Structure 1
């Protein structure tokens, strides 16, 4: 089997991407944030605290003939930005892009934090990291990908995110028309539950490439590129008037700037992030100070290849017995 679904930016900045997902019988379609940095499929629902729902589409298990309470199971998660959610759990039929998993754990939110409430376009999360990070207790549950894997033509999914445009998530096959050149694969550590890999270095603009190992995670659920302070300083030093602002919470630059590209290494291959991908717009409405798309990871504890980096490539999440990550230009 295979599945193929379009993913669409939620706003003009590509703050996140949503993908339609069918849950239950008759289908209930919710737009979920596919997140390769976590491992819970959770949704806004008929159980969510009413004051915490603001425009989201909700899952109503009582309207699904295939929903079953997973008795006694609860879940609770918090993310690196400090957002969080929790609730109870149902099993139900879930389909993505034509691909169906029966018996999928669907985590029903009873509580969500303000950041989720405020994002009216995101109806929940679909985790695609390793199932060892799933938060359901007392019986840990499998991700959609883990459950689907034995049915797939190939034990892979691919992320092809667009810049200010729709993209695609594919399950079970690699679309050879979606990229240019060849795919370079690189080793993955699953020790922390993430798609954790080691970049071979970087370059700023047309500058020479610096060979240096940078361990990080491939995270579709994180907007920006978070890298060591040394690397990030080297980047922003090439932008007149850029500075790190403690009041804003990171590097800012003059909105009149043209940004240099940023290259990261994948083995002997190179992925180039165009400068415009690194512009996240005014820090506040009408401001002439713009927020940078490359930020320091210092104090996060991990480097994060978020959407800013991933959207510059065609990315293969290879869930074979020895998992690997592939990157191609596109």
Structure 2
């Protein structure tokens, strides 16, 4: 049958556009967290009657929906350089006005709450979202996206606000209470609501139950370099985060990984010589029953060749954890199974 789909379109990362400009990365600042600094994909949504359309990133690592407000205080706030949600053009709009305060490492986003029909992936969810009236100039003024759509759980929602997906489940009909992500090896990308597209995977899905109530995180049994397991011997966590673009781990663990690879460090990223790249061994993540491998081609891009792995010492609530970002999902088609509270993987195509 005909699916329910959100297409993902390529956009320049706010880091990328800085390189195009020619910015010195080291002279920036040291940079309740997801920068979207290297996020390179977005979909569109509608908000309200007539739908006011917005470019948004879909982030399984957070549980709020927010867009810029028409009530941004002119030039002062730096949100006025995106599309703004005018409530006076929506008949379905419903007032709320409870202040909301999302804190990021680069700055504090402020705004108020609002209710309205959201059109997404060919369907209408009545959502409660944030109307932002103050924005951090640093990342967001360079952004090509207008806002954020959480695909996380109520537990990680500021204000205990029901996430667009909960609302999708409870109100109205999806076939199955799941959703999947898929990236092309490259306008390339697709979310499906209520299914997995068979054309974009092969073989069979394999599942790992989420280890804790309200987050898309799972137990990882070991990280293997070449043929032998290096770190995560006694078990660590793996956060599947569609808002993140790369794989990340604790600095403790990331040091180890790169030493074995023989990738000398740049203070910005980890790099290898472009000749030596293809030689680099396979990395494999031990998740549930199966071993999920990433070849050199998958995580590599005369001496200037940067890798798709980074370090992120994530704070202790979600805990020390790894982060399977977009780079993993590009090779491994992923299904988020809210009905059974598990994540499932298959080879992409």
**1:246-325 correspondence to structure 2 within 5 Å:** 248=268, 250-254=269-273, 257-258=276-277, 260=280, 261-279=282-300, 289-298=304-313, 300=315, 301-320=320-339, 322-325=340-343
Whose helix fraction is larger, Structure 1's or Structure 2's? 2
Task: Give the superposition deviation at 1:101.
Answer: 0.6
Task: Call closer, same or farther: CA 1:311–1:65 in 2, change over 3 Å.
Answer: same
**1:39-58 correspondence to structure 2 within 5 Å:** 39-51=63-75, 52-53=78-79, 55-58=81-84
Task: Give the superposition deviation at 1:68.
Answer: 1.4
Could you tell me how far apart the structure 2 residues matched to 1:279 and 1:114 are? 31
Could you tell me how far apart the structure 2 residues matched to 1:163 and 1:112 are? 33
**1:81-120 correspondence to structure 2 within 5 Å:** 81-102=105-126, 104-120=127-143
Task: Call closer, same or farther: CA 1:97–1:186 in 2, change over 3 Å.
Answer: same
Residue 326 in structure 1 maps to residue 348 in structure 2: no
> Which residue in the other structure is 2:5 paired with?
4
Could you tell me how far apart the structure 2 residues matched to 1:129 and 1:162 are? 23
Q: What is the RMSD computed on CA atoms of the aligned residues?
A: 2.7
Unpaired stretches in structure 2, ≥5 consecutive residues: 17-37
Task: Call closer, same or farther: CA 1:3–1:235 in 2, change over 3 Å.
Answer: same
- Which string of whole-angstrom CA distances, capped at 9 and with x for unpartnered residues, describes residues 277-321 of structure 1? 4347xxxxxx9655432123346543222222222211111111x
Residue 196 in structure 1 maps to residue 217 in structure 2: yes
SS in 2 for 1:316: strand
What's the TM-score once normalised by structure 2's chain length? 0.80
Task: Call closer, same or farther: CA 1:291–1:46 in 2, change over 3 Å.
Answer: farther
Could you tell me how far apart the structure 2 residues matched to 1:200 and 1:50 are? 51
- Which string of whole-angstrom CA distances, capped at 9 and with x for unpartnered residues, describes residues 214-244 of structure 1? 2121111122211244543343234445225
The answer as to whether partners of 1:83 and 1:116 remain within 8 angstroms in 2 is no
Task: Call closer, same or farther: CA 1:21–1:274 in 2, change over 3 Å.
Answer: farther
Task: Call closer, same or farther: CA 1:185–1:84 in 2, change over 3 Å.
Answer: farther
> Which residue in the other structure is 2:254 paired with?
232
Task: Call closer, same or farther: CA 1:54–1:65 in 2, change over 3 Å.
Answer: closer
SS in 1 for 2:203: strand
Q: 2:163 aligns with which of 110, 128, 143?
A: 143
Q: 1:64 aligns with which of 83, 90, 94?
A: 90
SS in 2 for 1:5: strand
What's the TM-score once normalised by structure 1's chain length? 0.84
Task: Call closer, same or farther: CA 1:50–1:239 in 2, change over 3 Å.
Answer: farther
Task: Call closer, same or farther: CA 1:292–1:190 in 2, change over 3 Å.
Answer: same
Could you tell me how far apart the structure 2 residues matched to 1:297 and 1:175 are? 32
